[PDB]
Amino acid sequence: ECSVDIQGNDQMQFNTNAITVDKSCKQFTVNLSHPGNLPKNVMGHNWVLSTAADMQGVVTDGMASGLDKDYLKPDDSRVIAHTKLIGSGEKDSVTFDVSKLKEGEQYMFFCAAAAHAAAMKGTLTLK
Ligand SMILES: [Cu+2]
Numbered sequence: 001e002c003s004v005d006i007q008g009n010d011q012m013q014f015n016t017n018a019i020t021v022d023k024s025c026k027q028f029t030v031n032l033s034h035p036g037n038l039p040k041n042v043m044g045h046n047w048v049l050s051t052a053a054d055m056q057g058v059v060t061d062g063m064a065s066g067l068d069k070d071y072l073k074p075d076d077s078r079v080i081a082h083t084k085l086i087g088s089g090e091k092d093s094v095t096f097d098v099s100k101l102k103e104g105e106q107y108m109f110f111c112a113a114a115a116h117a118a119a120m121k122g123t124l125t126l127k
Helices: 052-065
Strands: 003-007 018-021 027-033 048-051 091-097 107-110 121-126
Touching: 048 052, 052 107
Parallel strands: 003 027, 018 121
Antiparallel strands: 027 091, 048 107, 107 121
16 A cells, blocks of 8 residues: 555644655555644645755745645745645545655655644655
């Protein structure tokens, strides 16, 4: 299996803080869903992948871009993979090539929604 299921909920939480990608997968899929009640503008989430090196920069410029851009600088080359921003009752999936991921590199996933990254983040690692 070359996928993971992850939820972002109304208490500003992902349901994992460490994802592992089997390094023999050609592609890997992240299936994000929102089990809450709150509207997208107040507790909307996305799942965003970057290097540890780029995480805060992505989060900072993302907050500048704001809700109307899904809290991501458009065409940000630092974002390896991301889902759409989703609100209550919604789900989005993103697939990327495992060849984008390098050995000897540190990757972090996080929600880019304003202020959410502090709580909503973890590591992604090939194994
Ligand atoms: Cu969020």
